[PDB]
Structure 1
Amino acid sequence: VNSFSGYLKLTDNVYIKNADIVEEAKKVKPTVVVNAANVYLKHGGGVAGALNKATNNAMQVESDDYIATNGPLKVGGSCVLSGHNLAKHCLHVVGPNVNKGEDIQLLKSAYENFNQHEVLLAPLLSAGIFGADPIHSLRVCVDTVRTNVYLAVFDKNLYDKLVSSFL
């Protein structure tokens, strides 16, 4: 048993809810929250911007030190950093950004990072301002992640369409 509530069962291991990922983290304090990161860990807007704002910019300060030491992530890659006030850990995962011309086949590689963690609170990778089709992102998630993933979908309209169209 875990602390996630009202989540709507999609598969053996994948659950979904209409919730802003920032809000949900504050309530649950999950072991792992996933950030929709870019390779520079520049959390300007989007989930990264909303998560970072909720940490009072401490996520960005920690991320700038990580990049100064290690250099940029790979598209499809990840790093584990602090979860600050939101979670124990934040798994920063880089899905391909369609609005930058990145290979959508890298979305599967991105979701493979989730398999290193038994339970995660996550957004749909490459959705929102990353430009991919969220229906596609949910299909890759279900077909790639084997650990237990709790997806939050910010848009009530999109949350309804993802459920209704789910095969």
Structure 2
Amino acid sequence: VNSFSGYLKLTDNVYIKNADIVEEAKKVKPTVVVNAANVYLKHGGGVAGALNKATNNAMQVESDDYIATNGPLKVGGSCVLSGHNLAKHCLHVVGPNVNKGEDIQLLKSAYENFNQHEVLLAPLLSAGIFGADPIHSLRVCVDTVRTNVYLAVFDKNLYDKLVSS
């Protein structure tokens, strides 16, 4: 239904809000929610763990079946799976693990996956344990995504830092 409310408009197509992405998805019921995944779709913590828990583990079951059939994703790549109760679809996107030496240029390829969908609810990619500077990830998002993206930033201090700049 895509009834996004309370977002700050950064550009014509990028919007941002201090919010829990699971709570947003339950309110809005978007066509697409983006998961910040790893190449094996092991949804162990962070955004991925929270989305999986909200689907009662069904996201993990579907992901495991995807991996058994297709093998792991490429860094910078993605796949569409069901959004279960949270969204129509879930776009699982793999940003680079910058801390482990994966090329940060792949953050551009990661965000390019968003351009296949007219509107997305999404987190900042690579911006937790993967070690990418969230200011940098937001800039790559703005420079790369041309479709409508609604970004949810969980931590208030970080949101305030991103929107001040």
TM-score of Structure 1 vs Structure 2, range by shorter chain = over 0.9
Q: Any conservation in 1 of the 2:55–2:84 contact (CA below 8 Å)? A: yes
- Give secondary structure in 2 for the equivalent of 1:115: helix
Q: Number of residue pairs matched?
A: 165
Distance 1:130 1:91 in 2: 18
Shift of 1:2: 4.7
Runs of 5+ in structure 2 lacking a partner? none
Runs of 5+ in structure 1 lacking a partner? none
Structure 1 residues 69 and 2, CA, compared in 2 at 3 Å: closer, same or farther?
closer
Q: Which moved more, 1:13-22 or 1:95-104?
A: 95-104
Alignment partner of 1:119 is 2:119: yes
Q: Deviations over 1:70-112 (max 9, x none)?
A: 0000000000000011000000000001232211010000000
- Give secondary structure in 2 for the equivalent of 1:138: helix
Output the TM-score relative to the length of structure 2.
Answer: 0.98
Percent identity (aligned): 100
Distance 1:29 1:85 in 2: 8
Output the TM-score relative to the length of structure 1.
Answer: 0.97
Distance 1:85 1:43 in 2: 17
- Give secondary structure in 2 for the equivalent of 1:136: helix
- Give secondary structure in 1 for the equivalent of 2:84: coil
Runs in 1 of length 4+ with deviation above 3 angstroms? none
